[PDB]
Amino acid sequence: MITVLRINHRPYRDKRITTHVALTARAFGASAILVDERDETLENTIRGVISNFGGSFSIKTGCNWIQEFKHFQGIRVHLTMYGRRINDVIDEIRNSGKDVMVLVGSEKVPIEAYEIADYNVSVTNQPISEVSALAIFLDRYFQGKEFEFEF
Amino acid sequence: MITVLRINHRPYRDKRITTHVALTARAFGASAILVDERDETLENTIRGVISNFGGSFSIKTGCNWIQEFKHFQGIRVHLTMYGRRINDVIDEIRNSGKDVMVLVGSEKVPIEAYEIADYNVSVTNQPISEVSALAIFLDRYFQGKEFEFEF
């Protein structure tokens, strides 16, 4: 099972981007998303989609991201442009058996992300979006099969 | 060569999402992005990245999207949740030889998108983001090789 940890969410600014992270997480095979800043509006919007499109994905907001990431029972992945090439590490991760927590920020990433993560992982070495980084991470994790998943 | 056509851009609201579409386009192997609403700020931000990270990607804003899409010399792809499965059609598209224009909207898509497109293409049947839809479309088009591209 993969859980997404979305940090640097600003509820009075980032409704759309974080919504897109959550939709992406769900569609590409993650079981849950945890969001650092409490946002009831976001929760409502995503629960609306879960209701209408099905499946058992969950969203929590207002999380202590450092403690979640530090104490997660499984592999801690941090998506970052400065990390190791996804294609270099994805097979180890997948073949490990373990649950995975994948951290995506909004560009202003704290140092604790690098300090905690088991793997710091780049999806290309170019500046992209947390949304596209996550989509590619999950696609590679699931070897493209997440297209066969039914909700 | 692939060009991205981003429509439904609202300059006084959608700076971040559209920026992410543009970054994603560039990193995943598109040659250009055309944006419907004029946005000099966006152009400046993306030209900043092109300068600093290299390569020859281009951005134009203020485009007549219907006329661009209608008269594009090549295959017109519209990314939409209601389309044909990407995996069903991507090989035809790739093997055609032709340049490709890929249209991504912001959810409120006009009918002209369906009317013009050579292929209406779904990346999963679930609601996702234009950013993640595009990333997957380009990855599949390039068969994952866009990770070997140098800027």
Ligand SMILES: CSC[C@H]1O[C@@H](n2cnc3c(N)ncnc32)[C@H](O)[C@@H]1O
């Ligand atoms: C607002 S974009 C910044 C965030 O997107 C993600 N990100 C951006 N570019 C990349 C990249 N090249 N590889 C992996 N993750 C990235 C990271 O999680 C970062 O915290």
Ligand SMILES: CSC[C@H]1O[C@@H](n2cnc3c(N)ncnc32)[C@H](O)[C@@H]1O
């Ligand atoms: C604000 S999200 C709406 C836009 O994202 C893209 N999009 C969203 N969901 C999908 C999907 N499942 N497959 C393909 N494109 C999609 C389409 O281009 C749409 O115009």
